[PDB]
């Protein structure tokens, strides 16, 4: 009977939807364990980068006085099925929307999502093929484009995903103030008692030549970008493995 | 005419949401077009809004019933379709009467949320 076989055909498709998804689970459990090496070798490159940029400032004064453009650089995955990472990032970006907001998102999904949603603030996006390892050159490409998008920018902010554990992927923010505001704060941390922890670091930079300081600023900015993309990839693979479990259970319930 | 146009628009929205629901269950709600996410959110609010506490079920519902005049049914749904209530929480439409009841419930939910946020912040 056709009606009975209609269900059989429907279940026939479900039975193989599982196999293809099961193979995808295996694919994404190789890359998760391949990128688990970072877990060991992270949390030490960015030590003096903290001193350069770690400033626990208020979330209102830093955006209310947007005299110049604020360049957001959210990190998004090329392929879907990751989970709620992209959705949360969009919520995090929607919560900061300003007159002086310029967007340079990363990843195909980021471009497509941010092109449609905010169409007069998006400028263009960066896309990387997940073929090689996330290297310094890619980070330098992100920064150079960010400057050309808005050279007279109050701040360049990177919104990415931090992989705390296999099941915990929080949202993290690296905020990089432009040269003029950074050197001004670096000048105050040196002379004044305020910002004690940065006093020695700041005076050790003011002693050197300016070009070295500019190179120092760019170099550490690149490292922060490199850490964000590296973490966002590890969170991506970890999240996909979890999501590709949820699909299995949904396809099992059916 | 306004009654007819609103009703057809509601039916079209719910029809599309049903079709999208097939994709949602299998893959997930986050594998959809950004346009289809807006439709889903509006459709879910419509589904919640269609519910109503009856005056004859004050025992099974535990809440006072409502009588909604047709002129408020048309206006409330027409506004919802336009999207003027997108900021309102989804649950605000659940088990309520007219749009005014939705707003009052949203206000109470916001007050409770603000209280919880204040308690969390004060914990610092």
């Amino acid at each position: 009977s056709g009606k009975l076989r209609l269900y059989k055909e429907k279940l026939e498709g479900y039975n193989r939807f599982y196999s293809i998804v099961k193979t995808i689970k295996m694919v994404t459990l190789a890359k998760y364990r391949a990128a688990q090496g970072r877990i060991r070798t992270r949390d030490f490159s960015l030590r003096y980068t903290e001193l350069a940029f770690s400033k626990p400032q208020a979330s209102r004064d830093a955006v209310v006085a947007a005299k110049n453009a604020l360049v957001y650089i959210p990190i998004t995955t090329n392929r879907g099925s990751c989970g709620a990472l992209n959705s949360n990032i969009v919520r995090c970006i929607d919560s900061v929307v300003s007159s002086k907001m310029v967007l340079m998102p990363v990843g195909k999904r980021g471009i497509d999502s941010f092109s449609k949603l905010y169409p007069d603030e998006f400028r263009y996006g960066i896309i990387n093929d997940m073929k090689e390892s996330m290297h310094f050159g890619y980070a330098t490409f992100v920064i150079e484009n960010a400057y050309e998008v808005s050279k007279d920018a109050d701040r360049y902010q990177v919104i990415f995903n931090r992989f705390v554990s296999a099941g915990v992927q929080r949202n993290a923010v690296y905020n990089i103030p432009s040269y003029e505001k950074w050197k001004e704060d670096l000048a105050d941390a040196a002379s004044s008692d305020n910002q004690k922890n940065r006093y020695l670091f700041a005076n050790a930079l003011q002693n050197e030549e300016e070009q070295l300081i500019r190179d120092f600023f760019d170099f550490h900015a690149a490292l922060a970008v490199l850490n964000a993309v590296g973490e966002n990839e590890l969170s991506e693979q970890a999240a996909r493995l979890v999501a590709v479990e949820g699909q299995l259970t949904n396809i099992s319930s059916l | 005419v306004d009654h007819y146009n609103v009703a057809q628009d509601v039916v079209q929205m719910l029809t599309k949401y049903r079709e999208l629901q097939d994709i949602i269950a299998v893959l997930g709600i986050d594998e959809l077009s950004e346009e289809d996410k807006l439709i889903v959110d509006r459709a879910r609010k419509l589904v919640k809004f269609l519910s109503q506490p009856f005056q004859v079920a004050e025992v099974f519902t535990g809440m006072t019933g409502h009588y909604v005049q047709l002129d408020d049914t048309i206006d409330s749904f027409s506004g919802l379709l336009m999207g003027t209530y997108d900021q309102v929480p989804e649950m605000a439409f659940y088990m309520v009467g007219g749009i005014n009841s939705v707003l009052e419930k949203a206000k109470k939910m916001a007050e409770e949320a603000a209280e919880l946020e204040k308690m969390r912040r004060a914990r610092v």
Binding site: - | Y85, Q87, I99, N100, L103, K107, A113, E117, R121
Partner: peptide
Amino acid sequence: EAAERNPTGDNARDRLLKEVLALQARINQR
């Protein structure tokens, strides 16, 4: 300018909507 020379239920909905939006914005701030 020449228009200047010669020349409530819905308000309640607008008032309530504004209050709810204000509360949802206030909670975000702090």
